[PDB]
Swiss-Prot record, chain B:
Name of the protein in question: 6-phosphogluconate dehydrogenase, NAD(+)-dependent, decarboxylating
Binding sites annotated in the UniProt record for NAD(+): 12-17, 35-37, 106
Stored SUPFAM superfamilies: 6-phosphogluconate dehydrogenase C-terminal domain-like, NAD(P)-binding Rossmann-fold domains
Keyword hit for Phosphoprotein: no
Originating species: Gluconobacter oxydans (strain 621H)
PANTHER family on file: 6-PHOSPHOGLUCONATE DEHYDROGENASE
Family annotation (InterPro entries): 6-PGluconate_DH-like_C_sf (IPR008927), 6DGDH_YqeC (IPR004849), 6PGD_dom2 (IPR013328), 6PGDH_C (IPR006114), 6PGDH_NADP-bd (IPR006115), NAD(P)-bd_dom_sf (IPR036291), Pgluconate_DH (IPR006183)
Highest taxon, organism lineage: Bacteria
A Pfam family reported for this protein in Swiss-Prot or TrEMBL: NAD_binding_2
Catalytic residues as annotated in Swiss-Prot or TrEMBL: 202, 209
Role summary: Catalyzes the oxidative decarboxylation of 6-phosphogluconate to ribulose 5-phosphate and CO(2), with concomitant reduction of NAD to NADH.
Pathway recorded for this protein: Carbohydrate degradation; pentose phosphate pathway
Keywords recorded for this protein, A-Z: Gluconate utilization, NAD, Oxidoreductase
Length: 318, 318, 315, 320
């Protein structure tokens, strides 16, 4: 059997768990984060002799040396940190090396980085990783984009980070056709570099739409017992019992509903705007997603302006 | 202490009422079925286990053949509106004091509370049952949200637990019974409250369903339109909808029964308005569901008016 | 020839001003508010000797007695207050008397009240009054509903409060049949009782839509100099100068823009009823819906989704 | 200033020719040229005698404008490649000091790029968003322009001529203090460097589209209050024209759009908003009303039928 070696930059609640799961599947990791505390923490959390701490990115480039290609998975805050790290890695890594980006990066930035790194020979892969904390125990749903050769090369570590066939039944109609079978295992090559983060962005948009639908549904259910109604028109409904009964054989059953049922038994903001850009770039209406994000995408000045205008309308200046 | 089976009449033998009768017979219960079409009532008798389904020709024949039990239970699943109202009135005329009348259709919950009062005048117990599952519910169980008196709920508990999916393989939500909640919700059927609350919960359920469905719809639309010719090939991605839908079922946030239906389809009404009406009655904002409803409403005049105003703005009248 | 007499219940910044304007057009008013101080204050602001104060509603009903019908304009906080006042006036007033409702009442409530008061022989009129504080000097845009006979009866007291033909240029094509000419004066009989507050509701919807359009436009303008953009892609625009230049022959010139230009150089969820109308008639209203949900927000609906997302990414 | 100026005008459409006619009516001289010689001579005939000179080519008017301190050329052509080609041809023909005004609907980034390109040739570039349409010939054009302060102060006569003026529009209380551009009270405003004029014109068009859609759906609700979809007991047959008219007198919705709506209802009873939404996205600014107004202009062939297909499969299953 063969195992692979991956560097990992950014050791948060997803990068550290990615490293731990990679070590649990036999692979070697070279980890590094801004705070050495969490770096040593994930080194202690990984399998014995499978995680090596790196103090700098030069240290990681030195510790990834060897025959096979050096793959570096970057899970840093999206924005300037990720861009700086990717440029520094393009400076440090060699020809055949691979730069994977798992952050919440703009997909156009991924296309630009791939174009910039192809000149230096470095292959660039963009990965949207879904699962959060459970991915360490239940596998990560990964939508990635890159070259076919790099995808076939990096397939081992992705199949290690993937959930697998798991408990989910196969949907009828996936037989014999021209589909990517790896999709049934939790990870999918969506296309060239940038497509993985694009489909991750649309995935998050759908997630926010469903989340807001749940929010207003449960809010209607709660407000059915509000004082604004007559007692003869009130229902004191149990939110937890409804969220629990909905989990079994209903049209609304989902993972979001499982989270909702677990939460009800216990008691920036414009991240979606990129999606609606892709919506207006393609002349496709997206009213539900737009409303869902504008429930949380709010401007204080845009509101106090209109409020001052209305107060001047009905009360004047003084 | 219940170790036998029950006897229920069923009026309205469609693709859900007939499935309910067949599922009751497969679970040991006896049914007395009748429909407007004699062919289909004999058909659903032929679809049930031998000796467990008895055909009735009129509602009087059903009320007669159902005598003997402690309470005659009559489940009516007819088109909501005038048909179901006429049937409930005829049953209130035919049934006696102890008898129970269950309404499984998509009736307005206000009509449910009205019928409940009117039949409580005659001593007849009225129960409203929102049934979610569609055709699948025949084999996978029906998620049921029902409202009625507590005694009647305890009486019809066998048939509701029979039609329900059950505990199943779905994992229990941590923190459930420590607080002493309703355990029957863990089987797929929940007593929501007085008569009318079950159809209310089912209505909000279908509103959330429409919201999530529209979210998935515009998400996959934004995905498909990445390969539309309205963009330059420099800015196009030829994404595979089936592969994306399949990879999303493996531990992603958008994993849902709706996503299962969407994946299967890609590899191959009335209650949203009432939910928005309840939201208006309770002064709760529902942007996602309001937009999902406005996707159903389409006015060509709403845009033609503004376009004519703009044409007059930039071209004038005379 | 003659002048008319009106009772006024509710003397806020709108009722007191309509009373004062009615007195400035020669009409007599009988005023009353819950706080006696503001009642005796509205008295005195009116024309001398033409405004009389009332202490109770029975006192007003006694002070309105005479040959012609007793008209009572009610401008109270919409809800239970206005409903209770109208139900009291239904008992105090008699046959033929007129009850005007100027508050922000649900139009279905207006239809119901009209049906309830028609049995007692009392005519009911619903008036949506637009203008606010500016209407005292510039007249009130009034959209009312009631009986045609009642509409023709209260025409003097509405033409007094109306702005008139004014300096506003006439729109070409306004000399055919089926056109109410009084609409060119600022007051219009929309239809039966309830239609006035209905059209006022849609008017407020349009107002909020335009207000949010202005807000988003000026937001996009001011944020062109925000540090989130590179310096080579930034403009330091002047909000007041733009609001001023837009007043002179632009497509966006409006009264809202005039208020905006005066405010810039100076530096709950009631629209949902509109939405219900749009839902009842299968009419898409995306712009009004977005404008409303900018101001219509739910505490539980927001913190619930935020808790679900926090559970998703952190547990 | 006690004289008039001479300006060339390229693109004699329903606004370019009207701009030339309004400039000549205010005493200025114009040198006009269009691809169609017939409409060129027509615009010459529509202007005051001796104040409009026809030109057959761009070089002809470039030679006809010589002698002046700076040759000013106003271009109102279809935005895109036509205007770009014309502007670069003028950059090739005109010399250092001359002024190129762009009155079309050009993207403001194109304006800043053209300004940077022409500033190296010494040519001053100005972008002028012109609002008013065909009415501006009689009522004046609301102009939001961007350029250097020098070229702004130079072409100030022709802009103040095309502007509507102070007029009968009441002054805003509180405009007597310092720090304000007084020319804004005349109908034209220097917004900033080149490109800012078309930017604010774009935001202006976005607000226009928002208010237009608001009026549209409002009148739709009103008209549908008498729809057959409602019971007879819940219907109002409202008069749209009368409502639009009564709204013009001292209501909150009184506007020029309302005047156009009322004039249209007496007869029977657009790419700037997308770039405005793009600017809002670039600046992390929410624009719900404008985004909804834009989505009303889009049509989704699959967005609704896909959800309906999924629901049909939910309640009926996949047969085969």
């Amino acid at each position: 059997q063969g195992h692979m070696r991956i560097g990992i930059i950014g050791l948060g609640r997803m990068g550290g768990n990615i490293a731990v799961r990679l070590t649990r599947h036999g692979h070697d990791v070279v980890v590094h984060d801004r705070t050495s505390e969490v770096t040593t923490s994930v080194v202690g959390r990984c399998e014995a002799g499978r995680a090596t701490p790196a103090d700098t990115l030069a240290d990681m480039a030195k510790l990834l040396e060897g025959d096979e290609h050096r793959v570096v998975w970057v899970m840093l805050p999206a924005g300037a940190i990720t861009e700086d790290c990717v440029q520094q890695l393009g400076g440090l890594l060699g020809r055949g090396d691979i730069i994977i980006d798992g952050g919440n990066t703009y997909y156009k930035d991924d296309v630009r980085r791939s174009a910039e790194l192809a000149e230096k020979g470095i292959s660039y892969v963009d990965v949207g990783t879904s699962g959060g904390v459970w991915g360490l125990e239940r596998g990560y749903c990964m939508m990635f984009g890159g070259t076919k050769e790099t995808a076939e090369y990096i397939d081992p570590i992705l199949s290690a980070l993937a959930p697998g066939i798991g408990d989910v039944p196969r949907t009828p109609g996936r037989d014999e056709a021209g589909h990517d079978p790896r999709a049934e295992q939790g990870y999918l090559h969506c296309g060239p570099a940038g497509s993985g983060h694009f489909v991750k962005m649309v995935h998050n948009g759908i997630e926010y739409g469903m989340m807001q639908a749940f929010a207003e549904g449960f809010d209607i259910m709660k407000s059915k017992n509000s004082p604004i109604l007559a007692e003869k028109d009130r229902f004191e409904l149990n939110m937890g019992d409804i969220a629990e009964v909905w989990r079994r054989g209903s049209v609304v059953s989902s993972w979001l509903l499982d989270l909702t049922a677990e939460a009800l038994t216990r008691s920036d903001s414009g991240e979606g705007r990129w999606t609606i850009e892709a919506a207006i770039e393609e002349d496709v209406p997206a009213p539900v997603m737009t409303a869902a994000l504008f429930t949380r995408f709010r401007s204080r000045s845009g509101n106090n302006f209109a409020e001052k205008i209305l107060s001047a309308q009905r009360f004047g200046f003084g």
